[PDB]
Paper text:
Clostridium thermocellum has extensive potential in lignocellulose biorefineries as an environmentally prominent, thermophilic, cellulolytic bacterium. Previously, five putative sugar transporters, denoted A to D and L and belonging to the ABC transport systems group, were identified in the genome of C. thermocellum, and the solute-binding lipoproteins (SBP) of these ABC transporters were shown to bind different dextrins by isothermal titration calorimetry (ITC) assays. To gain insight into the structural mechanism of the transporter specificities, 11 crystal structures, both alone and in complex with appropriate saccharides, were solved for all 5 putative sugar-binding proteins, thus providing detailed specific interactions between the proteins and the corresponding saccharides. Combined genetic, biophysical, and structural studies have provided solid evidence that transporter A and transporter B are the major glucose and cellodextrin transporters, respectively, among the five potential sugar transporters in C. thermocellum.
Similar to the typical SBP fold, all of the Cbps adopted two-domain structures connected by three hinge regions, with the buried ligand-binding site between the two domains. The crystal structures of both unliganded and glucose-liganded CbpA were determined to 2.10 and 1.85 Å resolution, respectively. According to the “Venus-flytrap” mechanism, i.e., ligand binding causes a dramatic conformational change of two-domain SBPs from an open to a closed state. Hence, the structure of unliganded CbpA assumes an open conformation, while CbpA in complex with glucose adopts a closed-conformation, resulting in approximately 37° rigid-body rotation with respect to the unliganded CbpA structure. Furthermore, the binding pocket of CbpA is distinctly small for the accommodation of a monosaccharide, and no additional space appears available for the binding of larger cellodextrins in CbpA, thus explaining the functional specificity of transporter A. The ITC experiments showed that among all of the tested substrates, only CbpA binds to glucose, with a dissociation constant (KD) of 240 μM. In agreement with the ITC data, NMR titrations showed that CbpA binds glucose but not cellobiose or cellotriose.
Author numbering: 32 to 319
Write the structure that this text describes.
Amino acid sequence: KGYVGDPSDEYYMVTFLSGIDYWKYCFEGFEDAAKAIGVTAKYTGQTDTDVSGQVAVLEQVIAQKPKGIAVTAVNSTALADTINSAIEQGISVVCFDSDSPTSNRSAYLGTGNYAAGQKAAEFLVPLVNYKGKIAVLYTVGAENSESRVQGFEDWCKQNAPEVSLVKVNDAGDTTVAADNLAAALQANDDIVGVFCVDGVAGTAGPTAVAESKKDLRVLAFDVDVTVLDKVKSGEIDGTVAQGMYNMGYWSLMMLYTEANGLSSKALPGNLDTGVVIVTKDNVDEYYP
């Protein structure tokens, strides 16, 4: 038995908010991984963010007895126990997008958030010519947001010494975010750029900049249709797209390799699927 697989070996991509466009980019790689090893790729998940619901839908995925599940967990600790029972009954499970690291999953395939911040700084800082202040709008307390800010700030400290940052909390709310960004622009007249780290920031960010009536360089995150339209119209300069296709593509490679055993050692633990800066040159490639 090599990589020529059987369409009878079922492999699930278990998600939350199954209907949103984000998972379409991921499953397109998951169902492209299965386009050559030729195994069965199914796409299921809970339609909402409910933790109780996600535990229930993966128990039914486990009930269908698959050789391997690529699952993104709603929480870092909620799917802890339900995924261990799966492994105890001969199921190979990796995690993509959102990881359950305290679990016994074999590998994680997702964005290196610290590295993602460095790449975002590699693009935004030259736009402001390596000088001035850059406002960073992020959710204080969110692990990935803090890692993106740290990578951003660290890149600036090593490569753009004349650049300083002002940290602005969005508090996971668009109304509070736009207010905090408005006050930041009022107190700091040397602000030349705005990095929107999360979704909430990608919404209240441009609004507080437009009301400011200041011409600043804005970089958002992810590929929401609202953000993509701002990139095409020229309201913002770009957005950071996660390697969603890579998350689905390489998840089945590790899952199948573990399912049968075509590698003598355990799989690599972490794959950084990277980020791509979406500008006017490539924004058409990311529209749903």
